[PDB]
Amino acid sequence: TVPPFIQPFEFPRFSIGQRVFIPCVVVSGDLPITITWQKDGRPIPGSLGVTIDNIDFTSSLRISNLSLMHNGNYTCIARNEAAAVEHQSQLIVRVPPKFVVQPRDQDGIYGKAVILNCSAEGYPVPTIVWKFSKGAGVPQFQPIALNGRIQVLSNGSLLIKHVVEEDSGYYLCKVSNDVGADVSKSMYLTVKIPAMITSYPNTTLATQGQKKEMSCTAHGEKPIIVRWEKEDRIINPEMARYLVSTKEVGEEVISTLQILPTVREDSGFFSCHAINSYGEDRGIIQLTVQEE
Ligand SMILES: *[C@@H]1O[C@H](CO)[C@@H](O[C@@H]2O[C@H](CO)[C@H](O)[C@H](O[C@]3(C(=O)O)C[C@H](O)[C@@H](NC(C)=O)[C@H]([C@H](O)[C@H](O)CO)O3)[C@H]2O)[C@H](O)[C@H]1NC(C)=O
Ligand SMILES: *[C@@H]1O[C@H](CO)[C@@H](O[C@@H]2O[C@H](CO)[C@H](O)[C@H](O)[C@H]2O)[C@H](O)[C@H]1NC(C)=O
Ligand SMILES: *[C@@H]1O[C@H](CO)[C@@H](O[C@@H]2O[C@H](CO)[C@H](O)[C@H](O)[C@H]2O)[C@H](O)[C@H]1NC(C)=O
Ligand SMILES: *[C@@H]1O[C@H](CO)[C@@H](O)[C@H](O)[C@H]1NC(C)=O
Ligand SMILES: [Ca+2]
């Protein structure tokens, strides 16, 4: 005879981690009345930690610790012998964009890919914006030039496809959604330089009986070793008329092979080889020796 009627309910605005109790109250209708709940048109999964209290003409959702997994549309269904009725509401809980875990200092290797990590929490999923202060001075943060080589990824991590020395510096990460904004602490990106031979004469001429010096300039992370070779034999110190010497000029190493005196047989290909933990390189110098 008298059908059930549910007292209209609407979920208030909630904060993450609060306690929630929401009753479905069947204020009229002949007994007995069966009251059940759905979430998003399905039974509430036991995984969700929602308690259901069925007390006479009521059924209540009880949640000890509100989390993002509780977001969704909840339906109360009240059925007796005469009729079944439904009432529904949307549970919305929003999370302010929070930096709980900051970005870490990282090493990038010149010429290779680096990802700068920046997961912040927030719902709605926050929009992520990166800033950059070139080099290790007092930071002055500027927008970043996105141009294929530098991209922001879906998870909000910064991709540098081919690191150059100019990428070395402070990076930070700003997050906003409707609820708020946050600005990460900066991290420092160090660009590691594989050993490079940057400069040498391609071909050079000596005179029999005279001193000849040939130099190579190397760059890269220290320690860096420069060795010389003549037609795949290593020029060892014990070699009588050859002297290898090194000097530091700024961040560069200048290696000099001195021959004293030069003989006709010194002519041919010399190589200077630089190695550090990150890489190696070589230069080739053709020596010709003219007559006295
Ligand atoms: C005579 O020797 C010179 C060196 O004294 C040779 O020059 C080299 O020529 C190369 C191609 O022919 C490259 O152009 C190289 O220049 C760069 C490069 O490889 O692009 C410039 C880059 O900016 C530099 N990268 C840095 C500094 O980070 C890169 C780097 O130093 C390499 O590791 C060098 O080993 O060099 C240029 O130096 C001439 O080709 C040679 N000529 C002849 C006739 O033999
Ligand atoms: C829960 O109910 C919402 C409506 O009250 C629903 O949101 C609407 O869905 C529309 C697409 O069908 C569009 O997204 C509108 O912008 C939005 O208001 C929401 O999608 C439902 N949530 C579920 C099923 O999880
Ligand atoms: C953010 O997004 C990146 C997804 O591309 C992820 O990194 C990748 O991991 C891949 C695994 O093989 C491979 O290493 C790619 O080179 C690298 O791009 C990155 O770790 C994600 N960040 C977090 C915090 O999860
Ligand atoms: C970046 O995130 C990935 C994926 O979880 C992680 O494994 C990697 O080592 C991170 N790098 C950091 C935090 O320096
Ligand atoms: Ca329905």
mmCIF file of C-alpha atoms in Angstrom, residues 8-291:
data_model
loop_
_atom_site.group_PDB
_atom_site.id
_atom_site.type_symbol
_atom_site.label_atom_id
_atom_site.label_comp_id
_atom_site.label_asym_id
_atom_site.label_seq_id
_atom_site.Cartn_x
_atom_site.Cartn_y
_atom_site.Cartn_z
ATOM 1 C CA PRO A 8 16.428 13.814 0.452
ATOM 2 C CA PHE A 9 20.165 13.847 1.334
ATOM 3 C CA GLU A 10 23.141 15.632 -0.253
ATOM 4 C CA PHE A 11 26.782 15.007 0.696
ATOM 5 C CA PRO A 12 28.253 18.247 2.197
ATOM 6 C CA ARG A 13 31.707 19.414 1.129
ATOM 7 C CA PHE A 14 34.322 17.207 2.899
ATOM 8 C CA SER A 15 38.102 17.478 3.703
ATOM 9 C CA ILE A 16 40.494 14.557 3.029
ATOM 10 C CA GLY A 17 40.989 12.246 6.085
ATOM 11 C CA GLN A 18 37.819 13.363 7.955
ATOM 12 C CA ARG A 19 35.193 11.002 9.442
ATOM 13 C CA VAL A 20 31.891 10.760 7.453
ATOM 14 C CA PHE A 21 28.427 9.462 8.433
ATOM 15 C CA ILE A 22 25.547 9.749 5.903
ATOM 16 C CA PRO A 23 22.099 8.341 6.618
ATOM 17 C CA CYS A 24 19.486 7.206 4.147
ATOM 18 C CA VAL A 25 16.272 7.697 6.094
ATOM 19 C CA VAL A 26 13.035 5.993 4.938
ATOM 20 C CA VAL A 27 10.581 8.403 6.652
ATOM 21 C CA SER A 28 7.398 6.743 5.247
ATOM 22 C CA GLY A 29 6.262 3.454 3.671
ATOM 23 C CA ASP A 30 4.807 0.182 4.959
ATOM 24 C CA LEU A 31 7.224 -2.287 6.660
ATOM 25 C CA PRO A 32 9.138 -4.368 6.065
ATOM 26 C CA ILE A 33 11.581 -2.091 4.056
ATOM 27 C CA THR A 34 14.924 -3.375 2.654
ATOM 28 C CA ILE A 35 17.522 -0.644 2.211
ATOM 29 C CA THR A 36 20.655 -1.174 0.158
ATOM 30 C CA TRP A 37 23.443 1.007 -1.324
ATOM 31 C CA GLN A 38 25.342 1.276 -4.593
ATOM 32 C CA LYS A 39 28.449 3.209 -5.503
ATOM 33 C CA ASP A 40 28.678 4.113 -9.239
ATOM 34 C CA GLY A 41 25.826 1.612 -10.010
ATOM 35 C CA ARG A 42 27.539 -1.376 -8.277
ATOM 36 C CA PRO A 43 27.717 -2.933 -4.784
ATOM 37 C CA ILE A 44 30.177 -1.045 -2.529
ATOM 38 C CA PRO A 45 33.483 -3.031 -2.663
ATOM 39 C CA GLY A 46 34.570 -4.278 0.855
ATOM 40 C CA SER A 47 38.056 -2.889 -0.210
ATOM 41 C CA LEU A 48 36.675 0.712 0.303
ATOM 42 C CA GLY A 49 36.372 0.570 4.161
ATOM 43 C CA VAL A 50 32.745 1.770 4.181
ATOM 44 C CA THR A 51 30.683 0.410 7.103
ATOM 45 C CA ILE A 52 26.897 0.135 6.574
ATOM 46 C CA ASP A 53 24.653 0.599 9.634
ATOM 47 C CA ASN A 54 21.105 -0.721 9.057
ATOM 48 C CA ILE A 55 18.990 0.560 11.922
ATOM 49 C CA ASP A 56 15.202 -0.009 11.612
ATOM 50 C CA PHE A 57 14.111 2.472 8.810
ATOM 51 C CA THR A 58 17.640 3.807 8.102
ATOM 52 C CA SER A 59 20.871 2.746 6.484
ATOM 53 C CA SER A 60 24.031 4.831 7.015
ATOM 54 C CA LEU A 61 27.428 4.918 5.328
ATOM 55 C CA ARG A 62 30.157 5.236 7.960
ATOM 56 C CA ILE A 63 33.731 6.124 6.886
ATOM 57 C CA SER A 64 36.503 6.489 9.569
ATOM 58 C CA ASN A 65 39.078 7.992 7.152
ATOM 59 C CA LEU A 66 37.867 9.720 3.933
ATOM 60 C CA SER A 67 40.214 9.124 0.935
ATOM 61 C CA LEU A 68 40.148 9.823 -2.839
ATOM 62 C CA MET A 69 38.898 6.237 -3.405
ATOM 63 C CA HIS A 70 35.512 7.349 -1.804
ATOM 64 C CA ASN A 71 34.849 9.870 -4.636
ATOM 65 C CA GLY A 72 31.719 8.800 -6.597
ATOM 66 C CA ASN A 73 27.973 8.614 -6.860
ATOM 67 C CA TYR A 74 26.173 6.786 -4.080
ATOM 68 C CA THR A 75 22.575 5.492 -4.403
ATOM 69 C CA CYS A 76 20.307 4.512 -1.540
ATOM 70 C CA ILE A 77 17.520 2.025 -2.582
ATOM 71 C CA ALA A 78 14.472 1.439 -0.390
ATOM 72 C CA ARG A 79 12.118 -1.415 -1.347
ATOM 73 C CA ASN A 80 8.913 -2.778 0.214
ATOM 74 C CA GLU A 81 6.174 -5.032 -1.274
ATOM 75 C CA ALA A 82 4.502 -1.997 -2.999
ATOM 76 C CA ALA A 83 7.481 -0.130 -4.593
ATOM 77 C CA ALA A 84 11.214 0.648 -4.737
ATOM 78 C CA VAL A 85 12.661 4.176 -4.640
ATOM 79 C CA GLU A 86 16.179 5.600 -5.089
ATOM 80 C CA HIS A 87 18.041 8.711 -3.991
ATOM 81 C CA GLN A 88 21.562 9.555 -5.092
ATOM 82 C CA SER A 89 24.326 12.038 -4.272
ATOM 83 C CA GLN A 90 27.956 12.671 -5.336
ATOM 84 C CA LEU A 91 30.681 12.408 -2.745
ATOM 85 C CA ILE A 92 33.383 14.935 -3.738
ATOM 86 C CA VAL A 93 36.563 15.298 -1.678
ATOM 87 C CA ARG A 94 39.374 17.511 -3.034
ATOM 88 C CA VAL A 95 43.090 17.477 -2.043
ATOM 89 C CA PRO A 96 45.182 20.702 -2.013
ATOM 90 C CA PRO A 97 48.291 20.346 -4.266
ATOM 91 C CA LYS A 98 50.942 19.201 -1.721
ATOM 92 C CA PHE A 99 54.765 18.717 -2.000
ATOM 93 C CA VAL A 100 55.323 15.970 0.668
ATOM 94 C CA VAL A 101 58.350 14.507 -1.291
ATOM 95 C CA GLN A 102 60.504 17.309 -2.899
ATOM 96 C CA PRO A 103 62.684 16.982 -6.077
ATOM 97 C CA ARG A 104 66.230 15.510 -5.438
ATOM 98 C CA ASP A 105 69.633 16.823 -6.710
ATOM 99 C CA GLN A 106 70.577 14.882 -9.905
ATOM 100 C CA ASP A 107 73.563 14.320 -12.257
ATOM 101 C CA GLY A 108 72.948 14.580 -15.993
ATOM 102 C CA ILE A 109 75.597 13.218 -18.422
ATOM 103 C CA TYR A 110 76.300 15.685 -21.328
ATOM 104 C CA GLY A 111 74.645 14.431 -24.586
ATOM 105 C CA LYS A 112 72.252 11.969 -22.813
ATOM 106 C CA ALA A 113 68.592 12.040 -21.552
ATOM 107 C CA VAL A 114 67.627 13.156 -17.974
ATOM 108 C CA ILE A 115 64.155 13.020 -16.304
ATOM 109 C CA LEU A 116 63.597 15.578 -13.453
ATOM 110 C CA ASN A 117 60.952 13.948 -11.140
ATOM 111 C CA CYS A 118 58.006 16.061 -9.769
ATOM 112 C CA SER A 119 55.029 14.064 -8.339
ATOM 113 C CA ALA A 120 52.910 16.323 -6.082
ATOM 114 C CA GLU A 121 49.597 15.101 -4.599
ATOM 115 C CA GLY A 122 46.354 16.935 -5.421
ATOM 116 C CA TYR A 123 42.873 16.171 -6.802
ATOM 117 C CA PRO A 124 41.914 17.498 -9.272
ATOM 118 C CA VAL A 125 45.349 16.281 -10.627
ATOM 119 C CA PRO A 126 47.396 19.515 -10.498
ATOM 120 C CA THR A 127 48.933 21.353 -13.516
ATOM 121 C CA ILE A 128 52.785 21.379 -13.172
ATOM 122 C CA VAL A 129 55.024 24.341 -14.288
ATOM 123 C CA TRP A 130 58.893 24.237 -14.207
ATOM 124 C CA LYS A 131 61.331 27.144 -13.552
ATOM 125 C CA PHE A 132 65.149 27.237 -14.201
ATOM 126 C CA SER A 133 68.118 29.280 -12.781
ATOM 127 C CA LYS A 134 71.208 28.601 -15.024
ATOM 128 C CA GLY A 135 74.358 27.825 -12.938
ATOM 129 C CA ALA A 136 75.163 27.811 -9.190
ATOM 130 C CA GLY A 137 74.727 31.540 -8.307
ATOM 131 C CA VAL A 138 71.857 33.004 -6.169
ATOM 132 C CA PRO A 139 68.844 31.571 -8.070
ATOM 133 C CA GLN A 140 66.866 33.850 -10.463
ATOM 134 C CA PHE A 141 64.077 31.544 -11.747
ATOM 135 C CA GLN A 142 62.841 32.016 -15.349
ATOM 136 C CA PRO A 143 60.368 30.037 -17.488
ATOM 137 C CA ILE A 144 61.889 27.112 -19.481
ATOM 138 C CA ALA A 145 62.048 26.988 -23.355
ATOM 139 C CA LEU A 146 59.986 23.882 -24.440
ATOM 140 C CA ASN A 147 61.136 23.006 -28.026
ATOM 141 C CA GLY A 148 61.225 19.191 -28.620
ATOM 142 C CA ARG A 149 64.587 18.748 -26.738
ATOM 143 C CA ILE A 150 62.979 19.895 -23.397
ATOM 144 C CA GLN A 151 59.454 18.467 -22.707
ATOM 145 C CA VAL A 152 57.131 18.191 -19.650
ATOM 146 C CA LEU A 153 55.683 14.607 -19.424
ATOM 147 C CA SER A 154 52.125 13.450 -18.405
ATOM 148 C CA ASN A 155 53.320 12.555 -14.841
ATOM 149 C CA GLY A 156 54.734 16.154 -14.753
ATOM 150 C CA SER A 157 58.430 15.000 -14.851
ATOM 151 C CA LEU A 158 60.792 17.242 -16.972
ATOM 152 C CA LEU A 159 62.509 15.434 -19.937
ATOM 153 C CA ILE A 160 65.792 16.888 -21.350
ATOM 154 C CA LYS A 161 66.495 14.679 -24.428
ATOM 155 C CA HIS A 162 70.197 15.684 -24.874
ATOM 156 C CA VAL A 163 71.775 17.383 -21.808
ATOM 157 C CA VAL A 164 74.181 20.308 -22.593
ATOM 158 C CA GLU A 165 76.408 22.159 -20.022
ATOM 159 C CA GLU A 166 73.959 25.159 -20.167
ATOM 160 C CA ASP A 167 71.231 22.928 -18.534
ATOM 161 C CA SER A 168 73.344 22.851 -15.300
ATOM 162 C CA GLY A 169 71.521 24.792 -12.558
ATOM 163 C CA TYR A 170 68.508 25.077 -10.172
ATOM 164 C CA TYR A 171 65.102 23.703 -11.283
ATOM 165 C CA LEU A 172 61.823 23.977 -9.310
ATOM 166 C CA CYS A 173 58.270 22.820 -9.831
ATOM 167 C CA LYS A 174 55.047 24.828 -9.169
ATOM 168 C CA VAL A 175 51.679 22.935 -8.880
ATOM 169 C CA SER A 176 48.120 24.398 -8.879
ATOM 170 C CA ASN A 177 44.551 23.046 -9.028
ATOM 171 C CA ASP A 178 41.188 24.687 -8.026
ATOM 172 C CA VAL A 179 41.898 24.009 -4.254
ATOM 173 C CA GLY A 180 45.361 25.692 -4.011
ATOM 174 C CA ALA A 181 48.946 26.009 -5.301
ATOM 175 C CA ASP A 182 52.420 25.020 -4.132
ATOM 176 C CA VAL A 183 56.080 25.722 -5.226
ATOM 177 C CA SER A 184 58.593 22.834 -4.750
ATOM 178 C CA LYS A 185 62.011 23.456 -3.204
ATOM 179 C CA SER A 186 64.611 23.740 -6.013
ATOM 180 C CA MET A 187 66.911 20.822 -6.927
ATOM 181 C CA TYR A 188 70.383 21.280 -8.564
ATOM 182 C CA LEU A 189 71.132 19.551 -11.894
ATOM 183 C CA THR A 190 74.897 18.778 -12.330
ATOM 184 C CA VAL A 191 75.960 18.090 -15.974
ATOM 185 C CA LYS A 192 78.816 15.472 -16.017
ATOM 186 C CA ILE A 193 81.201 15.979 -19.062
ATOM 187 C CA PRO A 194 82.700 12.822 -20.700
ATOM 188 C CA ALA A 195 86.428 13.253 -21.583
ATOM 189 C CA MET A 196 86.642 15.305 -24.852
ATOM 190 C CA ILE A 197 89.684 16.270 -26.918
ATOM 191 C CA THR A 198 88.598 19.742 -27.991
ATOM 192 C CA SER A 199 91.593 21.104 -29.861
ATOM 193 C CA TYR A 200 94.860 20.007 -31.635
ATOM 194 C CA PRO A 201 96.651 20.783 -34.897
ATOM 195 C CA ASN A 202 95.586 18.397 -37.648
ATOM 196 C CA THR A 203 99.074 18.414 -39.292
ATOM 197 C CA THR A 204 102.350 19.934 -38.136
ATOM 198 C CA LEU A 205 105.953 20.108 -39.369
ATOM 199 C CA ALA A 206 109.263 19.565 -37.501
ATOM 200 C CA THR A 207 112.967 19.884 -38.531
ATOM 201 C CA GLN A 208 115.438 16.952 -37.920
ATOM 202 C CA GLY A 209 117.640 17.819 -34.899
ATOM 203 C CA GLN A 210 115.140 20.391 -33.529
ATOM 204 C CA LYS A 211 112.670 20.308 -30.583
ATOM 205 C CA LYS A 212 109.010 19.728 -31.609
ATOM 206 C CA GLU A 213 106.015 20.223 -29.278
ATOM 207 C CA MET A 214 102.464 19.055 -30.141
ATOM 208 C CA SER A 215 99.546 19.814 -27.736
ATOM 209 C CA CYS A 216 96.018 18.503 -27.229
ATOM 210 C CA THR A 217 93.358 20.222 -25.061
ATOM 211 C CA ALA A 218 91.025 17.974 -23.051
ATOM 212 C CA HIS A 219 87.807 18.817 -21.080
ATOM 213 C CA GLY A 220 85.668 16.651 -18.824
ATOM 214 C CA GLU A 221 85.096 15.520 -15.210
ATOM 215 C CA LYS A 222 88.358 14.938 -13.182
ATOM 216 C CA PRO A 223 90.233 12.804 -12.790
ATOM 217 C CA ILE A 224 91.082 12.774 -16.569
ATOM 218 C CA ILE A 225 94.108 10.914 -18.101
ATOM 219 C CA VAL A 226 95.721 11.917 -21.439
ATOM 220 C CA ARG A 227 97.960 9.354 -23.096
ATOM 221 C CA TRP A 228 99.812 9.631 -26.385
ATOM 222 C CA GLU A 229 100.358 6.902 -29.035
ATOM 223 C CA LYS A 230 102.515 6.779 -32.234
ATOM 224 C CA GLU A 231 101.008 4.265 -34.772
ATOM 225 C CA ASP A 232 99.270 2.212 -31.920
ATOM 226 C CA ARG A 233 102.472 2.042 -29.632
ATOM 227 C CA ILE A 234 101.830 3.911 -26.237
ATOM 228 C CA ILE A 235 104.399 6.654 -25.661
ATOM 229 C CA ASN A 236 105.643 5.448 -22.212
ATOM 230 C CA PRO A 237 107.825 7.776 -20.010
ATOM 231 C CA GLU A 238 110.905 5.559 -20.480
ATOM 232 C CA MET A 239 111.022 6.520 -24.203
ATOM 233 C CA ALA A 240 114.305 8.479 -24.645
ATOM 234 C CA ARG A 241 113.595 11.579 -26.775
ATOM 235 C CA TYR A 242 109.860 11.985 -25.869
ATOM 236 C CA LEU A 243 108.491 13.933 -22.871
ATOM 237 C CA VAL A 244 104.739 14.175 -22.127
ATOM 238 C CA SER A 245 103.697 17.070 -19.862
ATOM 239 C CA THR A 246 100.269 18.320 -18.555
ATOM 240 C CA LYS A 247 99.002 21.724 -17.385
ATOM 241 C CA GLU A 248 95.585 22.817 -16.033
ATOM 242 C CA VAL A 249 94.199 26.042 -17.619
ATOM 243 C CA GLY A 250 90.803 26.663 -15.995
ATOM 244 C CA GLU A 251 88.700 23.481 -16.325
ATOM 245 C CA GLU A 252 90.881 22.374 -19.334
ATOM 246 C CA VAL A 253 93.906 20.033 -19.341
ATOM 247 C CA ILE A 254 96.606 20.767 -21.952
ATOM 248 C CA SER A 255 98.833 17.758 -22.758
ATOM 249 C CA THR A 256 102.109 18.409 -24.639
ATOM 250 C CA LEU A 257 104.261 15.783 -26.327
ATOM 251 C CA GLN A 258 107.804 17.132 -26.708
ATOM 252 C CA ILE A 259 110.297 15.396 -29.076
ATOM 253 C CA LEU A 260 113.955 16.525 -28.603
ATOM 254 C CA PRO A 261 115.712 16.075 -30.875
ATOM 255 C CA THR A 262 113.287 15.070 -33.689
ATOM 256 C CA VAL A 263 114.469 12.427 -36.228
ATOM 257 C CA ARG A 264 112.971 11.602 -39.695
ATOM 258 C CA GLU A 265 111.469 8.347 -38.283
ATOM 259 C CA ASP A 266 109.254 10.430 -35.852
ATOM 260 C CA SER A 267 107.011 11.320 -38.870
ATOM 261 C CA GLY A 268 103.482 9.770 -38.974
ATOM 262 C CA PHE A 269 100.232 9.783 -36.972
ATOM 263 C CA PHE A 270 100.231 10.622 -33.235
ATOM 264 C CA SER A 271 97.112 10.268 -31.239
ATOM 265 C CA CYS A 272 96.150 11.972 -27.982
ATOM 266 C CA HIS A 273 93.577 9.986 -25.923
ATOM 267 C CA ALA A 274 91.540 11.411 -22.987
ATOM 268 C CA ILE A 275 89.585 9.208 -20.573
ATOM 269 C CA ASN A 276 87.496 9.850 -17.457
ATOM 270 C CA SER A 277 84.800 7.665 -15.743
ATOM 271 C CA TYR A 278 82.137 9.117 -18.132
ATOM 272 C CA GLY A 279 83.861 8.672 -21.533
ATOM 273 C CA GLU A 280 86.922 8.855 -23.799
ATOM 274 C CA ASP A 281 87.963 10.708 -26.947
ATOM 275 C CA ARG A 282 90.984 11.044 -29.200
ATOM 276 C CA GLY A 283 92.602 13.508 -31.553
ATOM 277 C CA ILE A 284 95.003 12.636 -34.404
ATOM 278 C CA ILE A 285 98.045 14.747 -35.323
ATOM 279 C CA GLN A 286 100.013 14.082 -38.500
ATOM 280 C CA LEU A 287 103.704 14.980 -37.990
ATOM 281 C CA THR A 288 106.057 15.497 -40.963
ATOM 282 C CA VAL A 289 109.796 15.942 -40.359
ATOM 283 C CA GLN A 290 111.869 17.888 -42.911
ATOM 284 C CA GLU A 291 115.702 17.685 -43.416
#
